[PDB]
Symmetry: D2
Subunit: 265 residues, 4 copies
Amino acid sequence: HMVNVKKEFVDNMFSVKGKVALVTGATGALGCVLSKAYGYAGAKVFMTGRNEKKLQALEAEFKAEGIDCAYGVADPADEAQVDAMITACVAQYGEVNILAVTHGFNKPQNILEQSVADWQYIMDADCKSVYVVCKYVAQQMVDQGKGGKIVVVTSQRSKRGMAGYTGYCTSKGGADLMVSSMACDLSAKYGINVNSICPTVFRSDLTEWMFDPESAVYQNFLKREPIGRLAEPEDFVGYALFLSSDASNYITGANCDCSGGYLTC
Amino acid sequence: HMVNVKKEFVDNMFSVKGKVALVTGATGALGCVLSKAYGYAGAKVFMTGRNEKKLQALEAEFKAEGIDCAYGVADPADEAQVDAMITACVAQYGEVNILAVTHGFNKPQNILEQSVADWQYIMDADCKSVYVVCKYVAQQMVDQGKGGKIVVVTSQRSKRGMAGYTGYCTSKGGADLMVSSMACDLSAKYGINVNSICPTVFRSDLTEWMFDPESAVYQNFLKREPIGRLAEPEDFVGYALFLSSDASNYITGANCDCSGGYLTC
Amino acid sequence: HMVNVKKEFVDNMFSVKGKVALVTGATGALGCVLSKAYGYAGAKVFMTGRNEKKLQALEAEFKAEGIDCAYGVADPADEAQVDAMITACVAQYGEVNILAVTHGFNKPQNILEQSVADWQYIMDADCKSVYVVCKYVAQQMVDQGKGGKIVVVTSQRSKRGMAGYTGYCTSKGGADLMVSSMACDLSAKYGINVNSICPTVFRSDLTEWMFDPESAVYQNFLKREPIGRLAEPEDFVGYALFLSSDASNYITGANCDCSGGYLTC
Amino acid sequence: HMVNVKKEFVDNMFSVKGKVALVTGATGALGCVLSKAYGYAGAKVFMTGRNEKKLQALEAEFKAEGIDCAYGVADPADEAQVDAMITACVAQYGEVNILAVTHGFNKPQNILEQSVADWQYIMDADCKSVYVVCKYVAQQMVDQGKGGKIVVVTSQRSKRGMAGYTGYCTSKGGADLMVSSMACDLSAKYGINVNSICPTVFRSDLTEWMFDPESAVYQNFLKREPIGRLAEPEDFVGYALFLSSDASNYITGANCDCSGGYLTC
Ligand SMILES: NC(=O)C1=CN([C@@H]2O[C@H](COP(=O)(O)OP(=O)(O)OC[C@H]3O[C@@H](n4cnc5c(N)ncnc54)[C@H](OP(=O)(O)O)[C@@H]3O)[C@@H](O)[C@H]2O)C=CC1
Ligand SMILES: NC(=O)C1=CN([C@@H]2O[C@H](COP(=O)(O)OP(=O)(O)OC[C@H]3O[C@@H](n4cnc5c(N)ncnc54)[C@H](OP(=O)(O)O)[C@@H]3O)[C@@H](O)[C@H]2O)C=CC1
Ligand SMILES: NC(=O)C1=CN([C@@H]2O[C@H](COP(=O)(O)OP(=O)(O)OC[C@H]3O[C@@H](n4cnc5c(N)ncnc54)[C@H](OP(=O)(O)O)[C@@H]3O)[C@@H](O)[C@H]2O)C=CC1
Ligand SMILES: NC(=O)C1=CN([C@@H]2O[C@H](COP(=O)(O)OP(=O)(O)OC[C@H]3O[C@@H](n4cnc5c(N)ncnc54)[C@H](OP(=O)(O)O)[C@@H]3O)[C@@H](O)[C@H]2O)C=CC1
């Protein structure tokens, strides 16, 4: 006759303690914040990116605070580099339990002025690289046989188009569907949950042209933000850790709204 | 030069300890589970519903496990009863910090056989009651001046129609938009976040004609569940507590996917 | 070996000639335009609304141009008035083949200042009335046994919330799901297609405060209009007639985007 | 005081007579049907594809029925071939007014068994080729200065994931967002409307293992089809011609539902 919920489950459901979290784009604005948040929450953090100097600086900062972390240099669009990077993570920590995909690139340009090569450059850096990293990490999680969590950072641009964004919106719109299809491929058979988060823009990225009366960018975002402010990377730490823990075990194939209401107004 | 995320924030972001959580439909399958989960997580729980016998049984069960809880009897569609119930919660705990709306009703019937009165009965019990409870609790949160969290349980039926569901789908589809509009009304000015969760069906609700070969209900849901199983109410505890804590402070006006991939396949 | 498409089908697929089109809210900005467009396209037009003076003026204008039309006075939220109005249409024209639902009401107000009675007033006028008219017309189409077309005018607000719109967004968000559920109830068994159109605002409705520098309404819509201008009612004539003809025979349960890109940017 | 709609507009709004319609994937199941429908509706049809034998057979069939048509051989992923093909269309007809993109490719495979090269093959043939054709045709429409219409055939898979579809769903999900972004780039400044149609599957594509009791494909689609049947290519002729005519002048950046209710149930 007792309610079907366990105190031990509730007390520990948000935990990532002792889990190995592999973070791509770890040197980025969101990547460095998520990497340190996983570390602060007790995960072993394996950071990856192309920028070795920035990875080394993060590793030193984190180790000084007792975070168990390491890094591997790799271009996420290059499958041989990604494969070798996962091998190094596995040699260091024995397994991969959580993957957070945060790397990305954009170069807005109207379709008329944007060459096919320039559109492809965005697709390779932002979309192909998501397939590469997810395929190779999912294979590693399958090989382990313990399930796993994959969190892909897309954008609110995955669901709304924008002038100059034929490259970025195709990549992000595609990645949200890639995520839903990966959940169809992996969740039931292997216990690997695959979800995306769709953020709005960060405040720091709009600071340069913020004081220009000729620019409406900063204003356009605020009229469209029911939350009442632009985001900071720390605003998505809760959602990412939620999607990386037992608390979200039933959640898969979702494209989570991190827009502060931009998507629903 | 340090990464912009604080250890104290990460360690405590999912906390609901010491918060007053008011749960409607507390006697229901999800309501009783969410009410006990808030209690296990250290919130003061104020349970509400029309069924006094069931509320008393939950209060006794919870108190035996050291949960600080109370109840108030009210029909959530009755604004005088809802106002008296919130006053009773305030007399007991001094404030309301979290609201979880879980009550509901359905009676599927084809439009041709469903009277206008029967469609209205579903709208009153399932949609009007959401407006009543959210309005009165939001007013109480405004009066306190400390912000708050509102979590409305809608359904994956808020985004997908179904035969016999002209009542329920209108109510749920409407409640998702009511939530997005409430965030536009309250989040920026008052710090009240308003979100919904959109669950798929519970396993226990399909168990009776599960052994009936003439029924395709049980199988229809499984072909459409990438997660690979039907849900239990405890599968939504993580999402509800996430949306009731500091970890989701930037998240407002969202209609969160709790479908296990039903919405994205 | 011939391509599977018929010239006779292509030549006549957009036709509404000789069909009986029942238009609710016929006295409104969109209603009068749609009613005259059905007439110009050769349909028999039965106009309905509460405003008899305006219905009489439209009937005289249309008859002077050789349009076969008639009217019936009814409050669309009142099932006895709707039932009697359909009987009068059937006595005049023998059947109903197309239904276009265009009536509506809004009174924006923040949830804190909007009474439950005021929210209900919008729900009754804008949502309940859609259920009433669709149920009674669908029953008439079932009784005829020749199928039919139902086009419900909702709003882009059916998918995006807005400050002060807890009444209107609930009603419109609900009506889109009611439409999808009605298609589940009626399309396969009775050949009745049920779709909605989701328009952006009309230019004429924003003309009053257009010259006010303190108002950002007119500007906010234009930043969010990829089409580059606000709409006129005549801009939705094509979509409504398309959804009322053989050209859309496979299309049902859809919530059609008439936003000029507001929904997708 | 007359209603704001013109008889001349209503009578001619669905016309494509005398317009030059360039159809990609013209040899395909939908392409051949759309190409002949444009011809039957009086457009000059320029068919393109890689299969010359099939293009020649369609040209002979169409000319025998008085259709003014021509063809140009090109791989739509090859920008030099696409540029030469558009030049050939211009040499033949002097301009391009309508573009219908219907070519595509799929090879379903689980992410674990699908190489990065195989995923890229689908992206190139199904997504990159859409960018190539739309960019070069949009440039031609800009050069003419008379506006234009672009209709991209995506899939209901642009909004719903599926097992084995990480290639196809990324491509289609991306193309819907590419369409919305192209409307942001072109519609206001150049009068070029850009929309997609999202079809469900064709009956003929499921006929081979339809008699196989071990297969649930045929039944899975029918439980999810409120329209009550699988589609034929001719079922999308109305929507494509609607989106290619004056009747849809305000419609841009839309991803039109051609799913028969699969998307909304
Ligand atoms: N910031 C914002 O306002 C928003 C961002 N997004 C998206 O969210 C993600 C995180 O954003 P944010 O942290 O600000 O991103 P950043 O601009 O800080 O970039 C993240 C990291 O991506 C890597 N990167 C850059 N270019 C490429 C490339 N050509 N190929 C592969 N990797 C590359 C870099 O790491 P390294 O050089 O070490 O490889 C960089 O540090 C990105 O995908 C971004 O597109 C979504 C919504 C809004
Ligand atoms: N269970 C499922 O499979 C799914 C449920 N949902 C929705 O999620 C919510 C929670 O579901 P679940 O816990 O299973 O629901 P229940 O069937 O257990 O009902 C929840 C509570 O609602 C109250 N209630 C019942 N009828 C009415 C009414 N006429 N007016 C007001 N309150 C009423 C009852 O409490 P009391 O008598 O104490 O007032 C009941 O205990 C509901 O809104 C449901 O519609 C969504 C997706 C799937
Ligand atoms: N105009 C716009 O900018 C937009 C409008 N919409 C919606 O599209 C529809 C058509 O818009 P539009 O033509 O401009 O609307 P109108 O403002 O012109 O109203 C349409 C008709 O609805 C009837 N009506 C008014 N109040 C009520 C009520 N309380 N109960 C029942 N019927 C009522 C009136 O007819 P009578 O008095 O004869 O009964 C009126 O002529 C409406 O539902 C509107 O909400 C959607 C997007 C934007
Ligand atoms: N048929 C269905 O059930 C559904 C189809 N779709 C999509 O709608 C579109 C039309 O469908 P349908 O007519 O049945 O498609 P088809 O299978 O008949 O293919 C369309 C044409 O695409 C061309 N094509 C094939 N492979 C490639 C390739 N590698 N690169 C470039 N072009 C290629 C071929 O023309 P050629 O050899 O002359 O170049 C083919 O005739 C496609 O994009 C399809 O993916 C969407 C929903 C369901």
